[PDB]
Amino acid sequence: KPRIPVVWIHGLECTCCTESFIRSAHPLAKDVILSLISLDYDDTLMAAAGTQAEEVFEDIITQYNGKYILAVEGNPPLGEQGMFCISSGRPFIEKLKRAAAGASAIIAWGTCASWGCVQAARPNPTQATPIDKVITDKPIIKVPGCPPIPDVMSAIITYMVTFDRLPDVDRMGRPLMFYGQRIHDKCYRRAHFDAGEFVQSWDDDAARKGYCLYKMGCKGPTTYNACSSTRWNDGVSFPIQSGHGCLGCAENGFWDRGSFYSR
Amino acid sequence: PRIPVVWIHGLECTCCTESFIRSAHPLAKDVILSLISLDYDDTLMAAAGTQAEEVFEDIITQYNGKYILAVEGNPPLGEQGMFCISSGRPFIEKLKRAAAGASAIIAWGTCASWGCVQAARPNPTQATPIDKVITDKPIIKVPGCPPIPDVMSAIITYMVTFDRLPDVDRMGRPLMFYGQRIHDKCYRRAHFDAGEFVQSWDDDAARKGYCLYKMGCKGPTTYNACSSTRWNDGVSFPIQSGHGCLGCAENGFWDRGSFYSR
Amino acid sequence: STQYETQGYTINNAGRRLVVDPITRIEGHMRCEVNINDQNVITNAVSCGTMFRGLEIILQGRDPRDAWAFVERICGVCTGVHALASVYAIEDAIGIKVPDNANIIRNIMLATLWCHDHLVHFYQLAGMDWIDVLDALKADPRKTSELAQSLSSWPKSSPGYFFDVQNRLKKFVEGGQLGIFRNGYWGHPQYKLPPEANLMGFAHYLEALDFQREIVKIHAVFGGKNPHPNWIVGGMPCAINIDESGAVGAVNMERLNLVQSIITRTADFINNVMIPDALAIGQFNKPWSEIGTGLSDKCVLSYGAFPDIANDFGEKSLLMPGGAVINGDFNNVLPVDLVDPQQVQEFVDHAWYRYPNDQVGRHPFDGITDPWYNPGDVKGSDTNIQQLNEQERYSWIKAPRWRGNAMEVGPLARTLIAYHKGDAATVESVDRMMSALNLPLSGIQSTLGRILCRAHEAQWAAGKLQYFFDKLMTNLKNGNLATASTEKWEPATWPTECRGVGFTEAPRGALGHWAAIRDGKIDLYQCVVPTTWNASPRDPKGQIGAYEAALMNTKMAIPEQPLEILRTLHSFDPCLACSTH
Amino acid sequence: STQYETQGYTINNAGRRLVVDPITRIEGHMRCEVNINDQNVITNAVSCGTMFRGLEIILQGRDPRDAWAFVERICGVCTGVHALASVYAIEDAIGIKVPDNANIIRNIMLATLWCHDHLVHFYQLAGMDWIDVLDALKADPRKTSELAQSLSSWPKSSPGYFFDVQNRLKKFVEGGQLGIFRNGYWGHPQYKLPPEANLMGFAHYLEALDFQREIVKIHAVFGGKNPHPNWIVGGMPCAINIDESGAVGAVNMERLNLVQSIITRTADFINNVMIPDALAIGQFNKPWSEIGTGLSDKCVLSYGAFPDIANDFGEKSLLMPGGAVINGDFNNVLPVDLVDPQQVQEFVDHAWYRYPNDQVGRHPFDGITDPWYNPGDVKGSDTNIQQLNEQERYSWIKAPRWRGNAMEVGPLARTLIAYHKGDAATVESVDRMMSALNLPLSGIQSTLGRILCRAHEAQWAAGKLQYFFDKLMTNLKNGNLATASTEKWEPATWPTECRGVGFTEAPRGALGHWAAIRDGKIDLYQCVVPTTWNASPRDPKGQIGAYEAALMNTKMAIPEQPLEILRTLHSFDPCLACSTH
Ligand code: SF4
Ligand code: SF4
Ligand code: SF3
Ligand code: SF3
Ligand code: F3S
Ligand code: F3S
Ligand SMILES: [Cl-]
Ligand SMILES: [Cl-]
Ligand SMILES: [Mg+2]
Numbered sequence A: 001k002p003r004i005p006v007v008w009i010h011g012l013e014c015t016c017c018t019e020s021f022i023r024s025a026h027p028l029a030k031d032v033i034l035s036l037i038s039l040d041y042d043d044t045l046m047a048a049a050g051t052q053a054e055e056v057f058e059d060i061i062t063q064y065n066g067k068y069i070l071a072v073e074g075n076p077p078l079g080e081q082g083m084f085c086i087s088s089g090r091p092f093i094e095k096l097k098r099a100a101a102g103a104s105a106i107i108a109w110g111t112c113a114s115w116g117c118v119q120a121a122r123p124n125p126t127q128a129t130p131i132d133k134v135i136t137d138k139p140i141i142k143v144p145g146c147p148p149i150p151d152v153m154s155a156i157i158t159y160m161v162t163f164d165r166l167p168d169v170d171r172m173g174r175p176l177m178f179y180g181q182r183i184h185d186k187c188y189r190r191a192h193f194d195a196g197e198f199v200q201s202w203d204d205d206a207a208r209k210g211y212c213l214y215k216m217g218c219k220g221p222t223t224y225n226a227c228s229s230t231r232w233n234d235g236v237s238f239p240i241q242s243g244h245g246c247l248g249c250a251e252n253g254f255w256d257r258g259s260f261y262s263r
Numbered sequence B: 001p002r003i004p005v006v007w008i009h010g011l012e013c014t015c016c017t018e019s020f021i022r023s024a025h026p027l028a029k030d031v032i033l034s035l036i037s038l039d040y041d042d043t044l045m046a047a048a049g050t051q052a053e054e055v056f057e058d059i060i061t062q063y064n065g066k067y068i069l070a071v072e073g074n075p076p077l078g079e080q081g082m083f084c085i086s087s088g089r090p091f092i093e094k095l096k097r098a099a100a101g102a103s104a105i106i107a108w109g110t111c112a113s114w115g116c117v118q119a120a121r122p123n124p125t126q127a128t129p130i131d132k133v134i135t136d137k138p139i140i141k142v143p144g145c146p147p148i149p150d151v152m153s154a155i156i157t158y159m160v161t162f163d164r165l166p167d168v169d170r171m172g173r174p175l176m177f178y179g180q181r182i183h184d185k186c187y188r189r190a191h192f193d194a195g196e197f198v199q200s201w202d203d204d205a206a207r208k209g210y211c212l213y214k215m216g217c218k219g220p221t222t223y224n225a226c227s228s229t230r231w232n233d234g235v236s237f238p239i240q241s242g243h244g245c246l247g248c249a250e251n252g253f254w255d256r257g258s259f260y261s262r
Numbered sequence C, D: 001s002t003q004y005e006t007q008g009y010t011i012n013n014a015g016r017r018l019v020v021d022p023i024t025r026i027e028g029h030m031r032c033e034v035n036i037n038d039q040n041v042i043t044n045a046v047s048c049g050t051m052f053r054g055l056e057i058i059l060q061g062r063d064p065r066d067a068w069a070f071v072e073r074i075c076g077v078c079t080g081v082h083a084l085a086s087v088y089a090i091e092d093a094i095g096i097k098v099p100d101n102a103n104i105i106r107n108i109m110l111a112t113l114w115c116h117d118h119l120v121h122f123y124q125l126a127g128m129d130w131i132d133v134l135d136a137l138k139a140d141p142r143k144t145s146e147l148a149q150s151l152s153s154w155p156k157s158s159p160g161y162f163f164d165v166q167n168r169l170k171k172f173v174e175g176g177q178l179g180i181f182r183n184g185y186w187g188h189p190q191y192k193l194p195p196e197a198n199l200m201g202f203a204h205y206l207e208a209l210d211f212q213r214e215i216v217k218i219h220a221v222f223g224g225k226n227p228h229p230n231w232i233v234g235g236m237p238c239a240i241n242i243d244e245s246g247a248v249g250a251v252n253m254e255r256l257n258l259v260q261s262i263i264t265r266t267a268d269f270i271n272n273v274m275i276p277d278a279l280a281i282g283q284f285n286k287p288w289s290e291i292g293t294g295l296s297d298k299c300v301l302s303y304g305a306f307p308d309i310a311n312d313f314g315e316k317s318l319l320m321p322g323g324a325v326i327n328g329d330f331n332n333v334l335p336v337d338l339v340d341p342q343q344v345q346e347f348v349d350h351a352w353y354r355y356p357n358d359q360v361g362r363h364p365f366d367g368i369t370d371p372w373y374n375p376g377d378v379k380g381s382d383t384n385i386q387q388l389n390e391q392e393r394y395s396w397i398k399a400p401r402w403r404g405n406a407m408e409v410g411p412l413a414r415t416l417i418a419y420h421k422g423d424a425a426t427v428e429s430v431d432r433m434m435s436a437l438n439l440p441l442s443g444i445q446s447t448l449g450r451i452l453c454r455a456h457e458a459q460w461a462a463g464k465l466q467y468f469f470d471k472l473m474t475n476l477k478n479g480n481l482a483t484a485s486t487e488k489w490e491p492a493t494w495p496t497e498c499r500g501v502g503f504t505e506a507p508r509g510a511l512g513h514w515a516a517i518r519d520g521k522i523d524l525y526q527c528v529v530p531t532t533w534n535a536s537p538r539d540p541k542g543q544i545g546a547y548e549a550a551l552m553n554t555k556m557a558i559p560e561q562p563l564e565i566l567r568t569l570h571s572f573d574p575c576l577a578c579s580t581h
């Protein structure tokens, strides 16, 4: 049984979403790559470089035109004619558009591809722009977070393969399954919020008992993600559980909503 | 040398021993091989019958005053104690002999701590918790039916590493894991606060993870670590999988009315 | 002393009496007594359950919806199976049908339990009867690696690994703190593995102790926790949401992924570690294919389990066959009906209970649990038993019989029933197994055979786990998400008076709960559990149960060291808390 | 064409020009061009960072307490190291001292990152330059097992395992969907492993891809998540409570038990899989001990890392030594000072940035990040680079120099510095390693050497992880629980104007953040990152950086298949997002 072809491209990014993907505990990234999909192009992991990598790219998007999923990590910069991000000597945006033209659907991994993320924070030196402002004629699934949760990434992939359909999305294009509710709506410290039991300074007695981080700047009340339920790294923790407020990292523009430590 | 531990079993279902072997960190293997000397344990030991009685006697004599005694289950006072018979005598005689030599006693589970299911009405056997029989030794109560595997192992590692008993509340439960209620750290609390409740099984509320209070959840009166530490290497806990807390770490939880009434 | 004949045995209590109390490496409390003749052959065997809690009494007056939680605490080893029997019984009483996904998930819970329980029994409970742990210290690590590699594709077979395991054991015993190995039977002449096989087995003991914790993550996903997961009358409480807002609050794709990853790992361990180890024990201990037969060549019983058609407990639905064989007639697998008062009955003439007439058996719908500790004329006193009196009351276990026959239940029993009903998978698996050992099919009817069948069933169950998961996913792909039926949740909807039977095949055998509901409350709740069958005391005819029969005629090399008694008893995987409840 | 001399090289851009764009199996975006002579030997090498984001610009005007979170997103591969440098820089500016447990935990975070990052680089990034994956399909599984068992005690070495791995690969490739193996260099004459070694390596590639996910569980415990864990100015947010009510809300004994279990597994994997594999790559590729030396015999730089005395960044505290060697004089390790304006400076005469005077180098406290895309004539157009013009501006990477010298940073640099300072563990480890390969000490100064040192460091870090954990537990046993200092958390407590330097050794080399705070906000934030050093373009003297130097003089077998270029560049573990920030 042929595996679904996936082309994974990288714009301006820090590679955290690729790193998150390989952290997947179930299915293991190994098993995704060997058994679930055909990861046919991926700068971070592929053997071929340079002209050989260009040949793979061109062959896959031609042979599987209309039939591959395009995964995009990072974003294109509009500044300097696009030459803030160069691939094969030309603007990354050209490779994005060419890849997007042949895709059946596009997964925008991370807050970078979804919204802009850190490079788009004020004053956005490069005019970094999210994928959906450039590609306007394809289904785009936004999977935001900096990075998204590893097992969320793999669960979205498995859903698409198993059910042969895209996940249903909210009005922003985020999968309902993992972005339908706020962090604060499933936070295990909510009892403390409800009771006015707050950490007021780091490592105070409240902090040592797991009191709410709202007065420390937690953005859980405005942030949609699965961190408080599905959690991180095979359920080991999430930001709040280890004592830091949510930064709001799955939400558009989160770097520019004031200090992480103001409420 | 590793700290000697004598683990005895009264009336029980062996859920606490099973829980212990589920430990993810440290692995029960490593606890047994490297952290303690598990010197008597009916469930796992090679020796049976007279050979098992010799181990029991040798260990409690040679290490008198120096072993930890773990107790799972409880003694029945009915029928002169012969609802639970070991080496042809009442179990309670073995409990008392073991307790007399122990440096400290760990009462694993709601059985040993409080009575659990056999003590529920009408308590046919007159099952009685350890602390009502042994009155002159430190008893650390580790309740739950059973307690959480990594709680059990964390208590053991604390005792070995820090060379001291955990600090306890007024009921003898370790503050570290029993200091707060389930409901004080429950991830569905937002829904409780909002009046967002499951009203019947598999309704739309249940499918979105709403609060189980109206389905009988006893989280608000139950002290344990299930909603934070969680179960089976953090995989789940009762509420996360859609069932209200039964209250299983609390004295008398079987006899507080239906599990499905508020 | 007396002597009488029953079931082809001569029961003779002359001769030296041996007592094994406590029996260890079992769940709960058991005492066993035997008489041996001058040739150190067992001529009498006495099985005694030494504990009782009274769940059947405790359950009176409870809400039927709560019953599963109470009876789940019958046992923590076979955890979940009493909950399953309970919900089946209450649903049968009230007239509730659950949705297909709830049934599939229940089947997953039971298959998961079979895998876990069988695995742990094989290594942690029975294993040390076959593997001489101390002899592992004499092995050559390379020859151990060669042995392992000849038996299996399992990766973990390097000489360095076996040397590391061996050094870990050496360090463990070096201080003289032998722990669970202290005062064992090591060196007994019945230990027949070579040192390399002992080191392989001991390594596997450790791997299994570690790995077993992973299997029950499946229980944690659908049931919240293990031990003692949660269930409901009407289905399961683990609501499913794959593609809607709030899936983070339910069984979603990530939770299902976790389940699939465990299932694959579980199958792999069972198939490449437990299976070849069971075969290896077989290869080095073939004489035990003729020891401990007991009732397994005469009378065997299965109720059947794993209904594949939701709410249909008939023959076409059950994936694990039911049926009864008596008189050694394996050509006539007889149908079992748990409502028929002439079929299952319990006797208490040799048990610590009262009946109005103790010479007759009571079907569980007429069951009585009125405890009466009355050991009569023991050698010793009623609080200091030197010798039980098997001519009178001698156990907390009731004596079940089927149409008056004493039956063996459990993996060997099921395997025989399925084999002889013509279940193709079972025939194939048994045939291939006995062929690899160069033993006739009759070699399964033995203590060795009980062990081989337990490994076979672990492999069977791991395969069924994948089958059930695939069915659940197929329903989800079709938009069929339902996990509970709640139209009869409220007591006002129930019949004023009704009764029901819930049955299944627990790891140790045929399990039944019989419940009567009246005016919204439990009016009667009687359990007959698999170790109640196997560990049964005698009946008014003097007929012996499965353990006592299997122990009959057994040679002991060293009377003071009951290795042969432990081997046979452990082969049935005794659950004494279950037996007495 | 032109030719000039620098650092012992002849830089000559006559001859055929080869372009490799994109460089894959790196983080981020890189282009490399070379010229080769008629003997297919590289005579010119050109390193180009093809991305920029501008974090130094974005950081202006931010709250200094927030800075760590921004700069952490410089890179997701070396995740955490920028956060560590930031909190160090901010604490140095303000005058904050953290509690001992915070320092210990920080050191745990960094050691965990070194373990994880070095492991993934070895297999997933560099490994396929050395292992011919397709040739694994020709291997004999028994001979593979034999090889593995000769090299290591690692358990997973059975012939069946290797056959199963091989069969998985066969089935993967059979339908033509080669995925990440498509259009690789397989069969190139520089692949020198025998088929058995290629199957062993590939199996390990898979085992490492799996195992790596477990190492970062340590970051999840202390830092909430990985990638991109959380930190605070003043310590760490992961408050500790061992023995008081509410330990369920904090780092407690169970959470520490989790960390210990990960540490043990991480050491075992590194020591028994990665280490023997690195040695085996060495044994089969000894000629690469003389290829890619570059600057490693001339100029190497370490800032030092892992302060063991909290808040003391001096020589007696740093567990990983700092120092600089220039002119090949390894007898005089020189002290580094990151405040000295004559030491670290960055040039942009060959980079896409504006300075008022591009012939001078700027220390980071006088740093300027004013992007200027100006490639001049590139044989195409501004949006179509056919050939960079290395006589003018050719990169988004600034050119750092130390006292005007071009330096190499990273594992090989640090190893050389520590060796030549007389660190005993380092001397012993390097001597034993080169002895086992029958190579002189100089063999480390090479592309092969970079890989060997990276493995060595992973082993070093795994050992330091335990050491740090034990130090944490010792404080906890003594009742010292503190994890944060908050005396200067509030901006009203800060100097109106102050500046600070935060430095460490990231997996790829020497990392520094220079920050200036004015009126409660970041006034300047400049980063010089290890790949900025290594991937550096040229300076006003035409001096070449570490990558360009290492590529010089290298023979290519097949010009169109740049395997030799990839091998050397990958040996430095290029992080282009880091380099450009
Ligand atoms: S910690 Fe954050 S998400 Fe949790 S209750 Fe408090 S504010 Fe809400
Ligand atoms: S589910 Fe139970 S414990 Fe959780 S918020 Fe509701 S009532 Fe409280
Ligand atoms: Fe870090 S790529 Fe994996 S979203 Fe925030 S940086 Fe972007
Ligand atoms: Fe763990 S033995 Fe199981 S019943 Fe409730 S604690 Fe008791
Ligand atoms: S910072 Fe991000 S990782 Fe989750 S808890 Fe908040 S959305
Ligand atoms: S039933 Fe028990 S296991 Fe925990 S969630 Fe409630 S205390
Ligand atoms: Cl954004
Ligand atoms: Cl109780
Ligand atoms: Mg009964």
Ligand SMILES: [Mg+2]
Residues within 6 Å of the ligand: D056, D398, D526, D527, D528, D529, D581
């Ligand atoms: Mg910079």
